[PDB]
Amino acid sequence: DRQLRRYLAPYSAEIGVDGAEKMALVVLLNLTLKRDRVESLCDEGLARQLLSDEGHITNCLHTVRWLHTHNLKYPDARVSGERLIINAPPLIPGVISSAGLPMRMGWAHDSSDINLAKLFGTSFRYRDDSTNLALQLVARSKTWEQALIGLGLTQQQLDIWCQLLASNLENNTFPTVVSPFSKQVRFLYQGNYCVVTPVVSHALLAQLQNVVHEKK
RNA sequence: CCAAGAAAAGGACUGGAAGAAAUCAUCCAAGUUGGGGACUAUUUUCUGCCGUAUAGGCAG
């Protein structure tokens, strides 16, 4: 059912997977293929086969390096450079912003990672909080690791991935230089001028897509 | 020191043909508008002559 793909989409409400970690790994791995090649996201065999392909998974692990909280390319695909990962600013009583929302990440690098990026960057509700596959494996979450080894992964392959997967989330969180296609505007601040560059919040935009259709 | 600064959407056209809304049908009954009254006020046009003359022309 297409409704499963809808509920796992970035513009839909998050769904719980507690006690279903085995089928969650199967569905999430199966999403890495083009829709024309998959008759069902529930086939354990296809998942066990995809998991054994270190190259396919390696190509998927590589997408983690560009997961972000704020998207510097949103209005204009020409912007080139590094990702941006920042905790939401303190709440201002008179302003609507990401300050009142929980932590979420998205993906945007070369435009050919639409399917391969879905294995680690797809979020879900777990232990009654918002998480994703990359975070549970980096944090050494045993329930997910036990299901993943059960689906055919060698302990030695997992012991190596925990390290490479974690490493991809440990650096390049702030751009080195201002990119040549970004916006720059200047105003007075504390008696002198400062240049401001705006950026769109992933969590805030994704929520708006749901609220306008539900609240009319 | 205005989500900063610059930007040519342009070219060509053929919707045409035919046509039958008809038949009948009844607005009636009575009715009471009605009593009073200053347009002349501080206003100008008055007096002689020619002429058969309330015609028609002139001096003050």
PDB file of C-alpha atoms (C1' of nucleotides) in Angstrom:
ATOM      1  CA  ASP A   1       0.000   0.000   0.000  1.00  0.00           C
ATOM      2  CA  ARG A   2       1.241   3.498  -1.101  1.00  0.00           C
ATOM      3  CA  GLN A   3       0.009   4.815   2.286  1.00  0.00           C
ATOM      4  CA  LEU A   4       3.112   3.252   3.929  1.00  0.00           C
ATOM      5  CA  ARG A   5       5.376   5.390   1.655  1.00  0.00           C
ATOM      6  CA  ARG A   6       3.173   8.440   2.532  1.00  0.00           C
ATOM      7  CA  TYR A   7       3.550   7.929   6.299  1.00  0.00           C
ATOM      8  CA  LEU A   8       7.358   7.550   5.936  1.00  0.00           C
ATOM      9  CA  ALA A   9       7.541  10.772   3.821  1.00  0.00           C
ATOM     10  CA  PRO A  10       9.207  13.919   5.323  1.00  0.00           C
ATOM     11  CA  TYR A  11       5.902  15.864   5.024  1.00  0.00           C
ATOM     12  CA  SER A  12       3.800  13.357   7.086  1.00  0.00           C
ATOM     13  CA  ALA A  13       3.368  12.841  10.852  1.00  0.00           C
ATOM     14  CA  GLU A  14       5.985  10.432  12.321  1.00  0.00           C
ATOM     15  CA  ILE A  15       4.873   6.838  13.158  1.00  0.00           C
ATOM     16  CA  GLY A  16       5.943   4.480  15.978  1.00  0.00           C
ATOM     17  CA  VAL A  17       8.091   1.304  15.302  1.00  0.00           C
ATOM     18  CA  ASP A  18       8.463  -0.011  18.948  1.00  0.00           C
ATOM     19  CA  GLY A  19       8.512  -3.901  18.893  1.00  0.00           C
ATOM     20  CA  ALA A  20       8.632  -3.965  15.048  1.00  0.00           C
ATOM     21  CA  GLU A  21      12.426  -3.277  14.578  1.00  0.00           C
ATOM     22  CA  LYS A  22      12.810  -6.381  12.317  1.00  0.00           C
ATOM     23  CA  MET A  23      10.202  -5.289   9.680  1.00  0.00           C
ATOM     24  CA  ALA A  24      11.341  -1.627  10.045  1.00  0.00           C
ATOM     25  CA  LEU A  25      14.879  -2.607   8.861  1.00  0.00           C
ATOM     26  CA  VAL A  26      13.310  -4.620   5.964  1.00  0.00           C
ATOM     27  CA  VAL A  27      11.031  -1.789   4.736  1.00  0.00           C
ATOM     28  CA  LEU A  28      13.682   0.943   5.147  1.00  0.00           C
ATOM     29  CA  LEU A  29      16.326  -1.126   3.247  1.00  0.00           C
ATOM     30  CA  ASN A  30      13.804  -1.988   0.479  1.00  0.00           C
ATOM     31  CA  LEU A  31      13.079   1.774  -0.066  1.00  0.00           C
ATOM     32  CA  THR A  32      16.627   2.173  -1.557  1.00  0.00           C
ATOM     33  CA  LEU A  33      15.464   0.679  -4.913  1.00  0.00           C
ATOM     34  CA  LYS A  34      13.516   2.384  -7.776  1.00  0.00           C
ATOM     35  CA  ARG A  35       9.681   1.787  -7.358  1.00  0.00           C
ATOM     36  CA  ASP A  36       9.578  -0.101 -10.770  1.00  0.00           C
ATOM     37  CA  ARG A  37      11.818  -2.966  -9.374  1.00  0.00           C
ATOM     38  CA  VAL A  38       9.947  -3.634  -6.024  1.00  0.00           C
ATOM     39  CA  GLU A  39       6.543  -5.514  -5.840  1.00  0.00           C
ATOM     40  CA  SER A  40       6.546  -5.106  -1.965  1.00  0.00           C
ATOM     41  CA  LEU A  41       8.578  -3.295   0.814  1.00  0.00           C
ATOM     42  CA  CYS A  42       7.743  -6.319   3.118  1.00  0.00           C
ATOM     43  CA  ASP A  43       9.818  -9.103   1.376  1.00  0.00           C
ATOM     44  CA  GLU A  44      12.458 -10.388   3.968  1.00  0.00           C
ATOM     45  CA  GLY A  45      14.413 -12.190   1.161  1.00  0.00           C
ATOM     46  CA  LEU A  46      15.049  -9.016  -0.943  1.00  0.00           C
ATOM     47  CA  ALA A  47      16.212  -7.228   2.295  1.00  0.00           C
ATOM     48  CA  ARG A  48      18.600 -10.134   3.259  1.00  0.00           C
ATOM     49  CA  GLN A  49      19.991  -9.974  -0.351  1.00  0.00           C
ATOM     50  CA  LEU A  50      20.368  -6.100  -0.354  1.00  0.00           C
ATOM     51  CA  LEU A  51      22.150  -6.239   3.095  1.00  0.00           C
ATOM     52  CA  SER A  52      24.889  -8.629   1.765  1.00  0.00           C
ATOM     53  CA  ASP A  53      25.823  -6.062  -0.974  1.00  0.00           C
ATOM     54  CA  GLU A  54      28.578  -4.021   0.856  1.00  0.00           C
ATOM     55  CA  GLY A  55      28.826  -1.673  -2.226  1.00  0.00           C
ATOM     56  CA  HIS A  56      25.057  -0.795  -2.184  1.00  0.00           C
ATOM     57  CA  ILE A  57      25.234  -0.167   1.644  1.00  0.00           C
ATOM     58  CA  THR A  58      28.586   1.730   1.270  1.00  0.00           C
ATOM     59  CA  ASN A  59      26.893   4.051  -1.318  1.00  0.00           C
ATOM     60  CA  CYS A  60      24.072   4.507   1.296  1.00  0.00           C
ATOM     61  CA  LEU A  61      26.547   5.129   4.218  1.00  0.00           C
ATOM     62  CA  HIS A  62      28.204   7.949   2.125  1.00  0.00           C
ATOM     63  CA  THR A  63      24.933  10.029   2.006  1.00  0.00           C
ATOM     64  CA  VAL A  64      25.122  10.585   5.833  1.00  0.00           C
ATOM     65  CA  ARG A  65      27.961  13.100   5.245  1.00  0.00           C
ATOM     66  CA  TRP A  66      25.394  15.719   3.936  1.00  0.00           C
ATOM     67  CA  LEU A  67      22.455  15.321   6.459  1.00  0.00           C
ATOM     68  CA  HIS A  68      21.577  18.894   7.722  1.00  0.00           C
ATOM     69  CA  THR A  69      19.136  20.797  10.102  1.00  0.00           C
ATOM     70  CA  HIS A  70      19.072  23.976   7.886  1.00  0.00           C
ATOM     71  CA  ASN A  71      19.214  23.923   3.987  1.00  0.00           C
ATOM     72  CA  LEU A  72      21.648  26.562   2.412  1.00  0.00           C
ATOM     73  CA  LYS A  73      20.523  25.509  -1.167  1.00  0.00           C
ATOM     74  CA  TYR A  74      16.709  25.803  -0.731  1.00  0.00           C
ATOM     75  CA  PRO A  75      15.796  28.840  -2.932  1.00  0.00           C
ATOM     76  CA  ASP A  76      18.627  28.231  -5.475  1.00  0.00           C
ATOM     77  CA  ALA A  77      20.301  24.925  -6.396  1.00  0.00           C
ATOM     78  CA  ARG A  78      23.481  26.771  -7.613  1.00  0.00           C
ATOM     79  CA  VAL A  79      24.776  27.351  -4.011  1.00  0.00           C
ATOM     80  CA  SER A  80      27.940  25.172  -3.515  1.00  0.00           C
ATOM     81  CA  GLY A  81      29.887  24.258  -0.296  1.00  0.00           C
ATOM     82  CA  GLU A  82      29.309  22.620   3.196  1.00  0.00           C
ATOM     83  CA  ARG A  83      26.157  21.528   5.216  1.00  0.00           C
ATOM     84  CA  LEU A  84      24.803  23.398   8.351  1.00  0.00           C
ATOM     85  CA  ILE A  85      23.859  21.602  11.685  1.00  0.00           C
ATOM     86  CA  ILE A  86      22.689  23.914  14.537  1.00  0.00           C
ATOM     87  CA  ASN A  87      20.420  23.495  17.605  1.00  0.00           C
ATOM     88  CA  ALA A  88      17.285  25.732  17.470  1.00  0.00           C
ATOM     89  CA  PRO A  89      17.701  29.290  18.963  1.00  0.00           C
ATOM     90  CA  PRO A  90      16.139  30.153  22.395  1.00  0.00           C
ATOM     91  CA  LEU A  91      12.382  30.954  22.225  1.00  0.00           C
ATOM     92  CA  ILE A  92      11.407  34.654  21.841  1.00  0.00           C
ATOM     93  CA  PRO A  93       7.815  35.186  23.208  1.00  0.00           C
ATOM     94  CA  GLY A  94       6.791  37.397  20.222  1.00  0.00           C
ATOM     95  CA  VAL A  95       8.216  35.255  17.319  1.00  0.00           C
ATOM     96  CA  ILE A  96       7.208  32.011  15.535  1.00  0.00           C
ATOM     97  CA  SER A  97      10.401  29.981  14.758  1.00  0.00           C
ATOM     98  CA  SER A  98      12.008  26.501  15.072  1.00  0.00           C
ATOM     99  CA  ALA A  99      12.699  27.183  18.819  1.00  0.00           C
ATOM    100  CA  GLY A 100       9.438  25.389  19.848  1.00  0.00           C
ATOM    101  CA  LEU A 101      10.012  22.275  17.632  1.00  0.00           C
ATOM    102  CA  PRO A 102      11.863  18.968  18.228  1.00  0.00           C
ATOM    103  CA  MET A 103      15.197  18.013  16.481  1.00  0.00           C
ATOM    104  CA  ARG A 104      14.932  16.692  12.798  1.00  0.00           C
ATOM    105  CA  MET A 105      17.391  16.250   9.810  1.00  0.00           C
ATOM    106  CA  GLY A 106      17.059  16.160   5.946  1.00  0.00           C
ATOM    107  CA  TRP A 107      19.247  15.486   2.821  1.00  0.00           C
ATOM    108  CA  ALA A 108      20.627  17.525  -0.229  1.00  0.00           C
ATOM    109  CA  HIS A 109      23.961  16.894  -2.134  1.00  0.00           C
ATOM    110  CA  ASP A 110      24.214  15.749  -5.860  1.00  0.00           C
ATOM    111  CA  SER A 111      20.469  14.909  -6.793  1.00  0.00           C
ATOM    112  CA  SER A 112      21.252  11.151  -7.520  1.00  0.00           C
ATOM    113  CA  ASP A 113      20.910  10.021  -3.818  1.00  0.00           C
ATOM    114  CA  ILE A 114      17.043  10.257  -3.599  1.00  0.00           C
ATOM    115  CA  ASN A 115      16.629   6.454  -2.944  1.00  0.00           C
ATOM    116  CA  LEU A 116      20.085   5.515  -1.430  1.00  0.00           C
ATOM    117  CA  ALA A 117      19.771   8.361   1.194  1.00  0.00           C
ATOM    118  CA  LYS A 118      16.408   6.860   2.506  1.00  0.00           C
ATOM    119  CA  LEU A 119      18.133   3.982   4.494  1.00  0.00           C
ATOM    120  CA  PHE A 120      19.722   6.281   7.152  1.00  0.00           C
ATOM    121  CA  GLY A 121      17.975   9.707   6.823  1.00  0.00           C
ATOM    122  CA  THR A 122      14.364   8.471   7.280  1.00  0.00           C
ATOM    123  CA  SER A 123      12.967   9.407  10.714  1.00  0.00           C
ATOM    124  CA  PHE A 124      10.468   7.526  12.969  1.00  0.00           C
ATOM    125  CA  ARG A 125       9.079   7.583  16.575  1.00  0.00           C
ATOM    126  CA  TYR A 126      10.908   5.193  18.979  1.00  0.00           C
ATOM    127  CA  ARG A 127      10.891   4.855  22.820  1.00  0.00           C
ATOM    128  CA  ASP A 128       8.381   7.760  22.558  1.00  0.00           C
ATOM    129  CA  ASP A 129      10.860  10.243  20.973  1.00  0.00           C
ATOM    130  CA  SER A 130      11.988  11.356  17.461  1.00  0.00           C
ATOM    131  CA  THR A 131      14.973   9.421  16.025  1.00  0.00           C
ATOM    132  CA  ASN A 132      16.242   7.738  12.824  1.00  0.00           C
ATOM    133  CA  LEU A 133      18.389   4.642  11.850  1.00  0.00           C
ATOM    134  CA  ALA A 134      21.799   6.464  11.832  1.00  0.00           C
ATOM    135  CA  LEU A 135      21.299   7.757  15.407  1.00  0.00           C
ATOM    136  CA  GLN A 136      20.245   4.356  16.891  1.00  0.00           C
ATOM    137  CA  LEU A 137      23.309   2.586  15.407  1.00  0.00           C
ATOM    138  CA  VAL A 138      25.815   5.387  16.345  1.00  0.00           C
ATOM    139  CA  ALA A 139      24.422   5.414  19.937  1.00  0.00           C
ATOM    140  CA  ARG A 140      24.881   1.546  20.131  1.00  0.00           C
ATOM    141  CA  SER A 141      21.136   0.726  20.510  1.00  0.00           C
ATOM    142  CA  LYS A 142      21.210  -3.074  21.115  1.00  0.00           C
ATOM    143  CA  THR A 143      17.613  -3.934  20.002  1.00  0.00           C
ATOM    144  CA  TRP A 144      18.267  -2.563  16.482  1.00  0.00           C
ATOM    145  CA  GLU A 145      21.725  -4.221  16.295  1.00  0.00           C
ATOM    146  CA  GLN A 146      20.296  -7.634  17.352  1.00  0.00           C
ATOM    147  CA  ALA A 147      17.595  -7.447  14.624  1.00  0.00           C
ATOM    148  CA  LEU A 148      20.194  -6.260  12.020  1.00  0.00           C
ATOM    149  CA  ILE A 149      22.640  -9.141  12.799  1.00  0.00           C
ATOM    150  CA  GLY A 150      19.593 -11.522  12.708  1.00  0.00           C
ATOM    151  CA  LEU A 151      18.788 -10.302   9.132  1.00  0.00           C
ATOM    152  CA  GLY A 152      22.264 -11.603   8.004  1.00  0.00           C
ATOM    153  CA  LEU A 153      24.851  -8.903   8.941  1.00  0.00           C
ATOM    154  CA  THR A 154      28.242 -10.244  10.261  1.00  0.00           C
ATOM    155  CA  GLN A 155      29.233  -8.852  13.737  1.00  0.00           C
ATOM    156  CA  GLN A 156      32.570  -7.680  12.190  1.00  0.00           C
ATOM    157  CA  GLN A 157      30.710  -5.709   9.449  1.00  0.00           C
ATOM    158  CA  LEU A 158      28.609  -3.952  12.178  1.00  0.00           C
ATOM    159  CA  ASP A 159      31.688  -3.216  14.385  1.00  0.00           C
ATOM    160  CA  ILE A 160      33.273  -1.353  11.395  1.00  0.00           C
ATOM    161  CA  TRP A 161      30.111   0.550  10.291  1.00  0.00           C
ATOM    162  CA  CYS A 162      29.346   1.876  13.829  1.00  0.00           C
ATOM    163  CA  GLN A 163      32.738   3.690  13.471  1.00  0.00           C
ATOM    164  CA  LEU A 164      32.423   4.988   9.867  1.00  0.00           C
ATOM    165  CA  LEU A 165      28.720   5.891  10.379  1.00  0.00           C
ATOM    166  CA  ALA A 166      29.562   7.847  13.579  1.00  0.00           C
ATOM    167  CA  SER A 167      32.582   9.569  11.893  1.00  0.00           C
ATOM    168  CA  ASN A 168      30.385  11.046   9.108  1.00  0.00           C
ATOM    169  CA  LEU A 169      28.331  12.933  11.800  1.00  0.00           C
ATOM    170  CA  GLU A 170      31.399  14.275  13.770  1.00  0.00           C
ATOM    171  CA  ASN A 171      32.667  17.226  11.607  1.00  0.00           C
ATOM    172  CA  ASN A 172      31.819  19.806   8.841  1.00  0.00           C
ATOM    173  CA  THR A 173      28.792  21.220  10.770  1.00  0.00           C
ATOM    174  CA  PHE A 174      29.568  24.917   9.902  1.00  0.00           C
ATOM    175  CA  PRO A 175      30.663  26.322   6.441  1.00  0.00           C
ATOM    176  CA  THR A 176      34.377  27.492   6.200  1.00  0.00           C
ATOM    177  CA  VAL A 177      33.702  30.519   3.833  1.00  0.00           C
ATOM    178  CA  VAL A 178      30.539  32.376   2.669  1.00  0.00           C
ATOM    179  CA  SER A 179      29.414  30.733  -0.639  1.00  0.00           C
ATOM    180  CA  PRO A 180      29.394  33.119  -3.722  1.00  0.00           C
ATOM    181  CA  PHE A 181      25.681  32.454  -4.528  1.00  0.00           C
ATOM    182  CA  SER A 182      24.334  33.068  -0.974  1.00  0.00           C
ATOM    183  CA  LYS A 183      22.408  36.187   0.153  1.00  0.00           C
ATOM    184  CA  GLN A 184      24.112  38.976   2.241  1.00  0.00           C
ATOM    185  CA  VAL A 185      22.201  41.989   3.884  1.00  0.00           C
ATOM    186  CA  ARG A 186      23.550  44.551   6.485  1.00  0.00           C
ATOM    187  CA  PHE A 187      22.034  46.509   9.413  1.00  0.00           C
ATOM    188  CA  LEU A 188      23.187  48.253  12.627  1.00  0.00           C
ATOM    189  CA  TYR A 189      23.757  45.960  15.677  1.00  0.00           C
ATOM    190  CA  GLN A 190      25.203  47.181  19.040  1.00  0.00           C
ATOM    191  CA  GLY A 191      26.274  50.523  17.463  1.00  0.00           C
ATOM    192  CA  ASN A 192      27.959  49.075  14.276  1.00  0.00           C
ATOM    193  CA  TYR A 193      27.182  47.094  11.026  1.00  0.00           C
ATOM    194  CA  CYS A 194      26.943  43.292  10.647  1.00  0.00           C
ATOM    195  CA  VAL A 195      26.101  41.163   7.581  1.00  0.00           C
ATOM    196  CA  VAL A 196      23.228  38.671   7.982  1.00  0.00           C
ATOM    197  CA  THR A 197      22.619  35.586   5.805  1.00  0.00           C
ATOM    198  CA  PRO A 198      19.238  33.875   6.258  1.00  0.00           C
ATOM    199  CA  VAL A 199      18.647  30.098   5.876  1.00  0.00           C
ATOM    200  CA  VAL A 200      15.439  27.959   5.797  1.00  0.00           C
ATOM    201  CA  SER A 201      14.692  25.598   8.693  1.00  0.00           C
ATOM    202  CA  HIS A 202      13.956  21.964   7.639  1.00  0.00           C
ATOM    203  CA  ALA A 203      11.773  21.139  10.686  1.00  0.00           C
ATOM    204  CA  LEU A 204       9.697  24.350  10.442  1.00  0.00           C
ATOM    205  CA  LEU A 205       8.930  24.099   6.696  1.00  0.00           C
ATOM    206  CA  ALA A 206       8.020  20.386   6.874  1.00  0.00           C
ATOM    207  CA  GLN A 207       5.500  21.043   9.701  1.00  0.00           C
ATOM    208  CA  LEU A 208       3.829  23.905   7.763  1.00  0.00           C
ATOM    209  CA  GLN A 209       3.104  21.554   4.828  1.00  0.00           C
ATOM    210  CA  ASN A 210       0.928  19.433   7.127  1.00  0.00           C
ATOM    211  CA  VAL A 211      -0.746  22.221   9.175  1.00  0.00           C
ATOM    212  CA  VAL A 212      -2.156  24.271   6.245  1.00  0.00           C
ATOM    213  CA  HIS A 213      -3.930  21.207   4.806  1.00  0.00           C
ATOM    214  CA  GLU A 214      -5.264  19.939   8.192  1.00  0.00           C
ATOM    215  CA  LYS A 215      -6.352  23.320   9.740  1.00  0.00           C
ATOM    216  CA  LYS A 216      -7.666  24.627   6.374  1.00  0.00           C
TER     217      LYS A 216
ATOM    218  C1'   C B   1      23.079  50.797   4.492  1.00  0.00           C
ATOM    219  C1'   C B   2      15.193  47.869   1.465  1.00  0.00           C
ATOM    220  C1'   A B   3      15.821  37.852   0.941  1.00  0.00           C
ATOM    221  C1'   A B   4      21.256  43.098  -1.303  1.00  0.00           C
ATOM    222  C1'   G B   5      23.255  44.446  -7.062  1.00  0.00           C
ATOM    223  C1'   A B   6      21.987  43.440 -13.352  1.00  0.00           C
ATOM    224  C1'   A B   7      17.498  40.535 -17.183  1.00  0.00           C
ATOM    225  C1'   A B   8      12.976  41.305 -24.562  1.00  0.00           C
ATOM    226  C1'   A B   9       8.510  35.226 -24.221  1.00  0.00           C
ATOM    227  C1'   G B  10       8.261  35.838 -29.427  1.00  0.00           C
ATOM    228  C1'   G B  11       6.523  33.991 -34.163  1.00  0.00           C
ATOM    229  C1'   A B  12       1.562  31.335 -37.745  1.00  0.00           C
ATOM    230  C1'   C B  13      -4.652  30.291 -37.626  1.00  0.00           C
ATOM    231  C1'   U B  14     -11.423  29.819 -41.473  1.00  0.00           C
ATOM    232  C1'   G B  15     -16.682  26.150 -36.159  1.00  0.00           C
ATOM    233  C1'   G B  16     -20.247  25.007 -39.929  1.00  0.00           C
ATOM    234  C1'   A B  17     -24.801  22.594 -41.696  1.00  0.00           C
ATOM    235  C1'   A B  18     -31.120  21.741 -40.595  1.00  0.00           C
ATOM    236  C1'   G B  19     -36.029  23.372 -37.239  1.00  0.00           C
ATOM    237  C1'   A B  20     -43.909  24.773 -35.998  1.00  0.00           C
ATOM    238  C1'   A B  21     -45.202  25.952 -28.447  1.00  0.00           C
ATOM    239  C1'   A B  22     -50.398  25.382 -28.712  1.00  0.00           C
ATOM    240  C1'   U B  23     -55.492  24.511 -27.021  1.00  0.00           C
ATOM    241  C1'   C B  24     -59.007  27.067 -23.088  1.00  0.00           C
ATOM    242  C1'   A B  25     -60.010  30.069 -19.338  1.00  0.00           C
ATOM    243  C1'   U B  26     -66.230  36.267 -15.553  1.00  0.00           C
ATOM    244  C1'   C B  27     -62.710  41.122 -10.023  1.00  0.00           C
ATOM    245  C1'   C B  28     -66.890  42.140  -7.176  1.00  0.00           C
ATOM    246  C1'   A B  29     -69.833  44.567  -3.421  1.00  0.00           C
ATOM    247  C1'   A B  30     -70.288  50.314  -0.010  1.00  0.00           C
ATOM    248  C1'   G B  31     -68.076  54.247   1.244  1.00  0.00           C
ATOM    249  C1'   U B  32     -69.376  63.523   3.744  1.00  0.00           C
ATOM    250  C1'   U B  33     -61.829  67.383   3.364  1.00  0.00           C
ATOM    251  C1'   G B  34     -62.744  71.722   6.267  1.00  0.00           C
ATOM    252  C1'   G B  35     -62.898  75.984   9.179  1.00  0.00           C
ATOM    253  C1'   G B  36     -60.007  82.252   9.132  1.00  0.00           C
ATOM    254  C1'   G B  37     -57.314  86.377   6.092  1.00  0.00           C
ATOM    255  C1'   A B  38     -55.418  94.439   3.775  1.00  0.00           C
ATOM    256  C1'   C B  39     -49.704  93.685  -1.559  1.00  0.00           C
ATOM    257  C1'   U B  40     -48.576  99.203  -0.621  1.00  0.00           C
ATOM    258  C1'   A B  41     -45.693 100.553   1.137  1.00  0.00           C
ATOM    259  C1'   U B  42     -41.061 107.468   2.091  1.00  0.00           C
ATOM    260  C1'   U B  43     -43.093 106.653  -3.422  1.00  0.00           C
ATOM    261  C1'   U B  44     -39.533 109.684  -8.420  1.00  0.00           C
ATOM    262  C1'   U B  45     -42.832 109.958 -14.595  1.00  0.00           C
ATOM    263  C1'   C B  46     -44.379 117.104 -13.050  1.00  0.00           C
ATOM    264  C1'   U B  47     -44.905 121.999 -16.455  1.00  0.00           C
ATOM    265  C1'   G B  48     -45.462 124.214 -21.517  1.00  0.00           C
ATOM    266  C1'   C B  49     -45.493 124.276 -27.426  1.00  0.00           C
ATOM    267  C1'   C B  50     -46.600 122.865 -33.009  1.00  0.00           C
ATOM    268  C1'   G B  51     -50.956 120.539 -34.828  1.00  0.00           C
ATOM    269  C1'   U B  52     -58.538 119.819 -37.554  1.00  0.00           C
ATOM    270  C1'   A B  53     -56.484 115.744 -33.577  1.00  0.00           C
ATOM    271  C1'   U B  54     -56.242 110.931 -26.626  1.00  0.00           C
ATOM    272  C1'   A B  55     -52.669 110.742 -34.463  1.00  0.00           C
ATOM    273  C1'   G B  56     -47.385 112.333 -34.865  1.00  0.00           C
ATOM    274  C1'   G B  57     -43.204 115.463 -33.671  1.00  0.00           C
ATOM    275  C1'   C B  58     -40.319 119.326 -29.711  1.00  0.00           C
ATOM    276  C1'   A B  59     -38.519 122.706 -25.211  1.00  0.00           C
ATOM    277  C1'   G B  60     -37.866 122.501 -19.608  1.00  0.00           C
TER     278        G B  60
END
